């Protein structure tokens, strides 16, 4: 019903999801009473394989992960999908024998939904984890802004630009590829806008710091002013980063 979060997800689910609906509407206008429904055992023979292989892979994946939200969330989706296949398989059993079976109609129709739903749940949970990785980079950068306050030496500044430069760069790559990955356009701009504002400010922050350093080591006036514009740059920078963090978490 709602649009898919990511194109990758959507690629996997749009073609299928659609098919169900035709089936949902289509059953209401029964096309049997003569046409009947063929034997789809073969079709179900494979799904039941692909599904046990999703649980193996998913199962492999849960072990090989530091993430804990994924660990708890992911398992329910295995069984949702694995349970759902069973319904399909019975339905195909029922139809070997009574192509006209009414509950097998529903058994086709609910089982297929279950596979879709549960597979969506895997993809969203795995994604939710990708976003968290990005978020972490974000949060860590944020911390690195807080320490801009304590820099008072060109020697210190150089490490700090050397440290913080490639944090910034990583973050850039991540969000540029994440904005490409998402279906909604409104959210896309929110990221690109927000992240362009940041990329601009990095040089400004470096500058505003060099000005601070010099006045601190210059025994002169307007020391406060250089400080103000410093803090401001960091404030504004953080505002944008926390926005990126927040927009990354929108599904609505």
């Amino acid at each position: 019903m709602p649009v898919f979060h990511t194109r990758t997800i959507e690629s996997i689910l749009e073609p299928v999801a659609q098919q169900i609906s035709h089936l949902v509407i289509m059953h209401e206008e029964g096309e049997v009473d003569g046409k009947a429904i063929p034997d789809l055992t073969a079709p179900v023979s494979a799904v039941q394989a692909a599904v046990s292989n999703l649980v193996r892979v998913g199962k492999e994946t849960v072990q090989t992960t530091e993430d804990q939200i994924l660990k708890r969330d992911m398992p329910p989706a295995f069984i949702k999908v694995e349970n759902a296949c069973t319904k399909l398989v019975r339905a195909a059993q029922m139809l070997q024998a009574d192509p006209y079976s009414v509950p097998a109609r529903d058994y086709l129709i609910d089982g297929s939904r279950g596979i879709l739903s549960g597979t969506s749940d895997l993809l969203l949970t795995f994604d939710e984890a990708e976003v968290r990785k990005i978020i972490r980079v974000c949060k860590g950068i944020l911390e690195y802004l807080t320490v801009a306050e304590v820099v008072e030496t060109m020697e210190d500044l150089v490490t700090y630009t050397k440290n913080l430069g490639p944090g910034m760069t990583k973050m850039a790559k991540m969000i540029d590829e994440r904005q490409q990955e998402l279906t909604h356009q409104e959210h896309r701009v929110m990221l690109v806008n927000s992240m362009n504002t940041v990329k601009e400010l990095l040089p400004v922050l470096i500058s505003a710091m060099k000005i601070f350093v010099t006045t601190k080591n210059t025994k002169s006036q307007g020391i406060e002013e250089a400080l103000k514009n410093r803090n401001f740059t960091v404030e504004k920078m953080s505002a944008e980063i926390n926005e990126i963090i927040r927009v990354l978490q929108l599904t609505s």
Partner: peptide, 16 residues
């Protein structure tokens, strides 16, 4: 994550 594509395909194919 593409086992999920495999699944999505067998089910798709089944709908006939």
């Amino acid at each position: 994550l593409e086992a999920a594509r495999n699944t999505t395909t067998m089910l798709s194919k089944t709908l006939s």
